[model samples]
Target: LATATATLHTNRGDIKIALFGNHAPKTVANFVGLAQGTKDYSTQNASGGPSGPFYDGAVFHRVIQGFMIQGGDPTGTGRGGPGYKFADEFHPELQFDKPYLLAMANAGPGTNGSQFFITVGKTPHLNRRHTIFGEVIDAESQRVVEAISKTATDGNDRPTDPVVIESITIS
Candidate 1:
């Protein structure tokens, strides 16, 4: 069993995450810190506020079926963050060829913050571009990912109906 495990409770359902700390230690550590409230996630505010044990009350701000579902913006605008950034932990071996894997959403290199996504299908374009720290570890969790992916979205791709994250517990 993996020592780095995180269970995300959402309004639609719960998804379990298995972190690949062995391959991406710093990225995994940052995620664990945010979920467990040990470390702060920096955002784009005036002070670049650090916040968390977060993900609670956060919406799945961006959802694109046949692609992925994204969230972790505190303001639910896909623009808000924990007010800080971290370096990427990408490796050639850490490819995005698998569905249901987790990766950090960044503006550019070394800008990983609180946002993340779960691939609903293979996404080779993301290879070595984002830090992949975890993957959905349960069949039920995959089901939730699938359901969220099919949700309605506007032109900007934000979910029309709210799909909230209740909590995220890392163990």
Candidate 2:
């Protein structure tokens, strides 16, 4: 099976994720390309964020206790993307059966972009809806994800403390 690993160095802590490239090859390739600055993308804001490493300095704009933490929007407003969209990838064997699972966040089918989420608890309802491409695979990473999930958020589910994704290392 095609697989990969990534480490998200955030302000709170580091999160390690195992990417299942075999099940979602395009999704994994897109994520890796963005993370490594090998792919071209644009931000929605006028400030014109860096084209290098799309996720660097991005924030987890949406956080919900016992739900999931969402990020990867260069605008950090949950309304930004990589200037494009792609089709969703689904594998019947891959399901959000537990916590710490990483999946794409989309407006609907064929809208997959840079936005993604990490589950903090079981999320069966998301099955076959979002592309399940990876998961937090280490205990320390799990703790960090869990910690981010519990952070205080405003009414819009925005983390008050500004959980930032400093950078990501993929291999």
Candidate 3:
């Protein structure tokens, strides 16, 4: 399992995202590859590695009331996707029932790319479908998700107050 350490600089606070490999090897690996800049994993870089850098400084594009905060779409319209898709990786060993799990939001079953979502509240429907890659290990960062949920969002789901993500780091 590959554990990654990344600091998400957000308007609320700096949320540290500790990626888990055991729970989501493919998803976490893809995130790590992008954050680490192992290759130019951009939306247009198909010949490159996974799409990681594309998510840097990206916003939580779509945020529902109590459902989830969806982002990481290339077009920033929730319709874009990474150049490639990966199969599902469900780790029974990891804590699935816990909140604040930073998992990859899938299209249907196993099509998880760069786009991901954060569970604001209890979401039992996301048991075995979403590719749970990591969680906000920093106890302080837990507030980031809650704070963003209360942001002034535009009709397109963009935060009206500008919930800009300063940066996304992985090491």
- Best by the lDDT measure: 2
Candidate-wise lDDT, in order: 0.82, 0.89, 0.70
Best by TM-score: 2
Candidate 1 vs candidate 3: which has greater lDDT? 1
The parts of candidate 2 lying over 4 Å away from their true place are 44-47
Model 1 segments more than 4 A misplaced: 41-52
lDDT of 2 at 29: 95
Query: What lDDT tens digits, residue by residue, belong to model 3 across residues 1-171?
Result: 437677777766887877787667767778766555564544642123344355556667777665667776655666667667779887776545777778888788867777788877777677787777777776788787878777778787776765555557766
Model 2: how far is 59 from its true place, Å?
Answer: 0.4
Local error of candidate 3 at residue 14 (angstroms): 1.0
Q: Kindly list the per-residue Cα lDDT of model 2 for residues 48-67, writing each as its tens digit.
A: 55557888888999999999
Cα lDDT of model 1 by residue, 58-109, tens digit = 7888998899999987788777677787899877667888899999998989
Q: Extract clashing residue pairs from model 3.
A: none
TM-score (C-alpha, index-matched) for candidate 1: 0.91
